């Protein structure tokens, strides 16, 4: 279990500074939700351990809070439209004479595509990918330790 | 079986806060419906266990409620049109001078496409995908425990 404070979160994300706009219990609830996506069981053998895991969790709560505040604000005609507003990465946008065309992320899976919707999720995905190297080897006993080798190693 | 309460759902989704707009019996009916898509049998050996499973069920209820409010509100000329309005992810939209083009989800299946149709279903799909890593293994017995190994292990 990892306890969620508000000082670190509010200094890390200055846009979520107003308590009136973002209550305490809202941030706490979204941290409890983010614990479901990423397990907060801290162990020293985990790839995500300590501050990396804490940053991953905080980024996910930022992602969820950004999506929720998008839902709440809307806006269609001063409120929430029917069915809400969907997320996802804006590949191309155009306002007036200005136009922007961004590169699409390599979202091969729904989890990655949902993460790419907001930049907090993009940073979380980047951290997960940069920590994802190699892998695990589960099972297997040291069979080689019973056979003698060069230079008298592991007789 | 998982008991559904109005309070957690309403604080989770502030858009569904008005009891007049979203009666209690409507939410309860959609919870009984969502129990079919995800079985609410809570077990400690399940990958969806406890709070993650409840969050998944609540997200699906929000999905179904969003489709229902899309249907009831409409609107074509002040009501519901013939054959209703279909869901699905808005890949590209254009209103006036404003244009938006979003990345398409990797929906390889009808269930995934229907989920990606709404933002609540998108979060549900992300949770299911992030919990769907590895897999199961049915059958099989500890055959190796009857054969001696290195270091006097499992003689």
């Amino acid at each position: 279990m990892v306890i969620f404070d508000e000082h670190k979160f509010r200094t890390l994300f200055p846009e979520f500074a107003d308590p009136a706009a973002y209550p305490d219990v809202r941030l706490q609830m979204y941290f409890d939700i983010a614990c479901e996506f990423i397990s907060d069981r801290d162990s020293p053998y985990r790839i995500l351990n300590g501050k990396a895991l804490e940053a991953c969790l905080y980024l996910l709560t930022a992602h969820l809070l950004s999506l929720s505040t998008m839902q709440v604000q809307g806006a269609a005609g001063g409120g929430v439209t029917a069915g809400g507003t969907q997320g996802g990465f804006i590949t191309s946008a155009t306002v007036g004479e200005v136009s922007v065309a961004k590169l699409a992320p390599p979202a091969k899976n729904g989890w990655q595509w949902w993460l790419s919707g907001t930049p907090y999720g993009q940073e979380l995905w980047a951290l997960l990918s940069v920590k994802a190297v190699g892998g695990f080897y589960i099972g297997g006993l040291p069979e080689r330790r019973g056979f003698r080798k060069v230079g008298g190693t592991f007789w | 079986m998982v008991i559904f309460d109005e309070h957690k759902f309403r604080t989770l989704f502030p858009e569904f806060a008005d009891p007049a707009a979203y009666p209690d019996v409507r939410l309860q009916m959609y919870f009984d419906i969502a129990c079919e898509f995800i079985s609410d049998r809570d077990s400690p050996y399940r990958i969806l266990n406890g709070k993650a499973l409840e969050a998944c069920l609540y997200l699906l209820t929000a999905h179904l409620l969003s489709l229902s409010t899309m249907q009831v509100q409409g609107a074509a000329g002040g009501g519901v049109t013939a054959g209703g309005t279909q869901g699905g992810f808005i890949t590209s939209a254009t209103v006036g001078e404003v244009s938006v083009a979003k990345l398409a989800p990797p929906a390889k299946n009808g269930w995934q496409w229907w989920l990606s149709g709404t933002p609540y279903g998108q979060e549900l799909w992300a949770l299911l995908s992030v919990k769907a890593v590895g897999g199961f293994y049915i059958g099989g017995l500890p055959e190796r425990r009857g054969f001696r190994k290195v270091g006097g292990t499992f003689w």
């Binding site: 040291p142 330790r145 019973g146 592991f154 007789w155 | 001696r148 290195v150 270091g151 006097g152 003689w155």
Partner: peptide, 25 residues
């Protein structure tokens, strides 16, 4: 010196017991 892995691999072959011998016979 004997290695630890070979040593306890050989040491694990202790006396099983008279009850075990009778039940295996």
């Amino acid at each position: 010196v004997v290695p630890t892995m070979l040593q306890d691999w050989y040491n694990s072959q202790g006396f099983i017991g008279y009850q075990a011998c009778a039940i295996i016979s």
